[PDB]
Short mmCIF file of C-alpha atoms and ligand atoms in Angstrom, two decimals:
data_model
loop_
_atom_site.label_atom_id
_atom_site.label_comp_id
_atom_site.label_asym_id
_atom_site.label_seq_id
_atom_site.Cartn_x
_atom_site.Cartn_y
_atom_site.Cartn_z
CA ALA A 858 0.00 0.00 0.00
CA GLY A 859 1.04 3.69 -0.31
CA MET A 860 0.60 3.86 3.48
CA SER A 861 -0.05 1.27 6.22
CA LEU A 862 -1.28 1.75 9.77
CA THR A 863 -0.53 -1.28 11.94
CA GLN A 864 -0.78 -2.01 15.68
CA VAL A 865 2.54 -2.44 17.49
CA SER A 866 1.13 -2.68 21.04
CA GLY A 867 -2.32 -1.96 22.48
CA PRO A 868 -3.39 1.60 21.43
CA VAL A 869 0.00 2.33 19.78
CA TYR A 870 0.18 2.01 16.00
CA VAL A 871 2.93 2.58 13.46
CA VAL A 872 2.45 4.52 10.24
CA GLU A 873 4.61 3.38 7.29
CA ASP A 874 4.34 6.34 4.80
CA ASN A 875 5.88 5.05 1.59
CA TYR A 876 5.42 8.36 -0.30
CA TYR A 877 8.65 10.05 -1.40
CA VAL A 878 11.38 8.69 0.88
CA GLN A 879 9.73 6.25 3.32
CA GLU A 880 9.00 7.94 6.70
CA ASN A 881 7.51 6.24 9.75
CA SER A 882 5.19 8.04 12.16
CA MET A 883 2.87 6.93 14.92
CA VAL A 884 -0.72 6.99 16.08
CA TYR A 885 -2.13 6.55 19.62
CA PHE A 886 -5.89 5.74 19.89
CA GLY A 887 -6.95 7.16 23.22
CA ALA A 888 -10.13 7.29 25.27
CA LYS A 889 -11.17 10.78 24.14
CA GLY A 890 -9.53 10.71 20.75
CA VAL A 891 -6.51 10.16 18.58
CA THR A 892 -2.98 11.61 18.82
CA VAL A 893 -0.79 11.55 15.68
CA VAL A 894 2.97 11.65 16.19
CA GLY A 895 4.46 13.17 13.06
CA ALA A 896 2.30 15.02 10.56
CA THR A 897 3.57 12.99 7.53
CA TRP A 898 4.98 14.38 4.29
CA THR A 899 2.13 16.38 2.69
CA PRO A 900 -1.52 17.42 3.15
CA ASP A 901 -2.32 14.53 0.74
CA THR A 902 -0.41 11.94 2.82
CA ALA A 903 -2.08 13.26 5.97
CA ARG A 904 -5.47 12.79 4.33
CA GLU A 905 -4.45 9.20 3.50
CA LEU A 906 -3.48 8.53 7.12
CA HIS A 907 -6.77 10.08 8.31
CA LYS A 908 -8.60 7.64 5.97
CA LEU A 909 -6.84 4.72 7.68
CA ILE A 910 -7.59 6.15 11.12
CA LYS A 911 -11.35 6.39 10.44
CA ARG A 912 -11.36 2.61 9.61
CA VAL A 913 -10.16 2.01 13.20
CA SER A 914 -11.92 4.63 15.33
CA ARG A 915 -14.65 7.22 15.03
CA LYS A 916 -13.09 9.38 17.73
CA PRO A 917 -11.71 12.88 16.80
CA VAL A 918 -8.05 13.43 15.87
CA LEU A 919 -7.19 15.68 18.79
CA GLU A 920 -3.68 16.73 17.93
CA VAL A 921 -0.63 16.07 15.77
CA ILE A 922 2.94 16.51 17.03
CA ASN A 923 5.63 18.06 14.86
CA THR A 924 8.68 16.22 16.23
CA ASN A 925 10.88 18.60 14.29
CA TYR A 926 10.40 21.50 11.86
CA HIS A 927 11.14 19.39 8.71
CA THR A 928 8.86 18.49 5.83
CA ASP A 929 8.57 14.82 6.77
CA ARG A 930 7.31 15.73 10.34
CA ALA A 931 5.32 18.88 9.53
CA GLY A 932 4.24 18.62 5.89
CA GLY A 933 0.78 17.43 6.71
CA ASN A 934 -0.06 20.38 8.96
CA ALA A 935 -2.41 22.16 6.48
CA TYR A 936 -4.62 19.08 6.57
CA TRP A 937 -4.55 18.51 10.28
CA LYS A 938 -5.39 22.20 10.93
CA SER A 939 -8.23 21.97 8.37
CA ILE A 940 -10.00 19.15 10.30
CA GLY A 941 -9.58 21.08 13.68
CA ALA A 942 -6.73 18.99 15.16
CA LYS A 943 -4.21 20.92 17.27
CA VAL A 944 -0.68 21.01 15.83
CA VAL A 945 1.72 20.66 18.73
CA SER A 946 5.49 21.41 19.03
CA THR A 947 8.19 22.77 21.29
CA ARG A 948 8.86 26.49 21.10
CA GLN A 949 12.23 25.82 19.53
CA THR A 950 10.66 23.68 16.74
CA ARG A 951 8.08 26.37 16.11
CA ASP A 952 10.68 29.16 15.93
CA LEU A 953 12.92 27.15 13.56
CA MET A 954 9.90 26.36 11.40
CA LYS A 955 9.02 30.07 11.08
CA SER A 956 12.53 31.02 10.10
CA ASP A 957 13.62 27.98 8.07
CA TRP A 958 10.49 26.39 6.50
CA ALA A 959 11.19 27.85 3.09
CA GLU A 960 14.77 26.56 3.23
CA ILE A 961 13.70 22.96 4.18
CA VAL A 962 11.00 22.95 1.49
CA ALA A 963 13.64 24.01 -1.10
CA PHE A 964 16.02 21.38 0.23
CA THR A 965 13.36 18.72 0.03
CA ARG A 966 12.60 19.60 -3.55
CA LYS A 967 16.24 19.34 -4.65
CA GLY A 968 16.10 15.58 -3.94
CA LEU A 969 12.36 15.26 -4.67
CA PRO A 970 11.33 17.70 -7.43
CA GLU A 971 7.82 16.11 -7.38
CA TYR A 972 7.34 17.32 -3.76
CA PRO A 973 4.92 20.25 -3.48
CA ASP A 974 5.98 23.83 -2.70
CA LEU A 975 4.04 23.89 0.58
CA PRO A 976 3.19 27.14 2.40
CA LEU A 977 4.19 27.56 6.04
CA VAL A 978 1.70 26.18 8.58
CA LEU A 979 2.86 26.68 12.13
CA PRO A 980 1.95 24.82 15.31
CA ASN A 981 -0.86 26.38 17.32
CA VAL A 982 -0.01 24.66 20.62
CA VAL A 983 3.58 25.39 21.66
CA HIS A 984 5.43 24.07 24.72
CA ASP A 985 8.37 25.65 26.50
CA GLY A 986 9.50 22.36 28.00
CA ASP A 987 8.78 18.68 27.81
CA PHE A 988 5.07 17.78 27.63
CA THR A 989 2.59 14.94 27.72
CA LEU A 990 -0.68 14.00 26.09
CA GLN A 991 -3.25 11.24 26.63
CA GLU A 992 -3.26 11.41 30.45
CA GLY A 993 0.50 11.07 30.59
CA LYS A 994 0.65 8.05 28.21
CA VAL A 995 2.30 9.98 25.30
CA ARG A 996 5.45 11.70 26.64
CA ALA A 997 7.43 14.16 24.50
CA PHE A 998 10.89 15.32 25.49
CA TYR A 999 14.07 17.12 24.38
CA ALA A 1000 17.45 15.41 25.10
CA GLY A 1001 19.59 17.74 22.94
CA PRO A 1002 20.53 18.37 19.27
CA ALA A 1003 21.13 15.58 16.81
CA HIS A 1004 19.62 15.18 13.35
CA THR A 1005 18.28 18.78 13.68
CA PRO A 1006 18.86 21.18 16.63
CA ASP A 1007 15.25 20.76 17.84
CA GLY A 1008 14.22 17.13 17.30
CA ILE A 1009 12.29 15.48 20.14
CA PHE A 1010 11.64 11.93 21.23
CA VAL A 1011 8.21 10.53 22.14
CA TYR A 1012 7.86 7.73 24.73
CA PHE A 1013 4.82 5.49 25.45
CA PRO A 1014 5.37 4.17 29.08
CA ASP A 1015 2.56 1.57 29.12
CA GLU A 1016 3.76 -0.15 25.91
CA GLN A 1017 7.59 0.67 26.47
CA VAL A 1018 7.84 2.05 22.92
CA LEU A 1019 10.13 4.94 21.98
CA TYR A 1020 9.52 6.88 18.80
CA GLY A 1021 12.88 7.60 17.31
CA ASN A 1022 11.77 10.40 14.95
CA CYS A 1023 14.42 11.22 12.26
CA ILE A 1024 17.02 10.70 15.01
CA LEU A 1025 17.01 6.88 15.01
CA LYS A 1026 16.97 4.74 11.84
CA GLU A 1027 19.01 2.05 10.02
CA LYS A 1028 21.06 4.08 7.57
CA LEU A 1029 23.26 7.15 8.37
CA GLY A 1030 21.67 9.55 5.85
CA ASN A 1031 23.51 12.65 4.51
CA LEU A 1032 23.60 14.75 7.78
CA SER A 1033 23.03 18.19 6.21
CA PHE A 1034 21.26 19.72 9.33
CA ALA A 1035 22.88 17.54 12.01
CA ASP A 1036 25.24 18.38 14.79
CA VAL A 1037 27.56 15.46 14.25
CA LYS A 1038 29.51 15.84 17.46
CA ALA A 1039 26.45 16.47 19.71
CA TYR A 1040 24.49 13.57 18.09
CA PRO A 1041 26.04 10.75 20.22
CA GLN A 1042 26.03 12.96 23.29
CA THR A 1043 22.27 13.29 22.80
CA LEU A 1044 21.84 9.55 22.42
CA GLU A 1045 23.89 9.01 25.64
CA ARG A 1046 21.66 11.57 27.45
CA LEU A 1047 18.67 9.51 26.24
CA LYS A 1048 20.20 6.20 27.46
CA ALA A 1049 20.98 7.78 30.87
CA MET A 1050 17.25 8.36 31.37
CA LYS A 1051 16.97 4.53 31.82
CA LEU A 1052 13.51 4.41 30.25
CA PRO A 1053 12.03 0.89 30.03
CA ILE A 1054 12.14 0.22 26.26
CA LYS A 1055 10.99 -2.90 24.43
CA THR A 1056 10.57 -1.33 21.01
CA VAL A 1057 12.13 1.61 19.19
CA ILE A 1058 10.27 2.86 16.08
CA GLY A 1059 12.86 4.13 13.58
CA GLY A 1060 11.58 7.19 11.68
CA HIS A 1061 13.01 5.99 8.40
CA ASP A 1062 13.86 2.53 6.89
CA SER A 1063 12.08 -0.48 8.54
CA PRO A 1064 10.44 0.88 11.69
CA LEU A 1065 10.29 -2.10 14.03
CA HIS A 1066 13.45 -2.49 16.21
CA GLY A 1067 14.61 -3.19 19.72
CA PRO A 1068 16.39 -0.75 22.05
CA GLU A 1069 19.61 -1.62 20.18
CA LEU A 1070 18.61 0.71 17.35
CA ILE A 1071 19.95 3.49 19.62
CA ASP A 1072 23.30 1.80 19.75
CA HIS A 1073 23.25 0.96 16.08
CA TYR A 1074 22.85 4.56 15.02
CA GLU A 1075 25.20 5.83 17.72
CA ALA A 1076 27.95 3.62 16.30
CA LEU A 1077 27.23 4.88 12.76
CA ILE A 1078 27.28 8.60 13.64
CA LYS A 1079 30.47 8.18 15.69
CA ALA A 1080 32.25 6.85 12.57
CA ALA A 1081 30.85 9.69 10.35
ZN1 LIG B 1757 13.25 12.45 8.53
#
């Protein structure tokens, strides 16, 4: 399929978005409604994810988290805003998006000329620190700069699943926005949290991994 939505554990689902370069995002089906983690690539891909969601639950999509300011994590925002979902980010992600959206859209289109020239659509719910959703069951946090200066992790304590965002994945990638030296220091800050983790969802390549994905990528970036 162009996109799949598949349960990993309980209310926690993984989105495989095979449009453009494959990106993986997440969905949490809660009591009051649905939280989307990563907006997906475009308003069209977001509509496709919403179609999959409505085959699972009739509850509202409450909010979507932009886990960084990039096109693969924020490109769907126009759609999510249009259906009345909140678009949620840290203040840092929001500020970088205002200043740098046009640059990341241009960068995206160098590699993917087919990708649309999307207008800026900023988050409307902005957090100055770490934050939670779903009665504390979706837990977003900053552990430092890595793939971008602002990228966050999201943790699901009940299911022991960590969303790795663009930060954790199988292949190095080309590192154009990364802070190569801070990257492993960020991953070691994350490990020092000692979060119970059964599953890491890589944000690119095949999503389903163990906690060793952290180590895998750490080893790669340290040889970069
Ligand atoms: Zn990415």
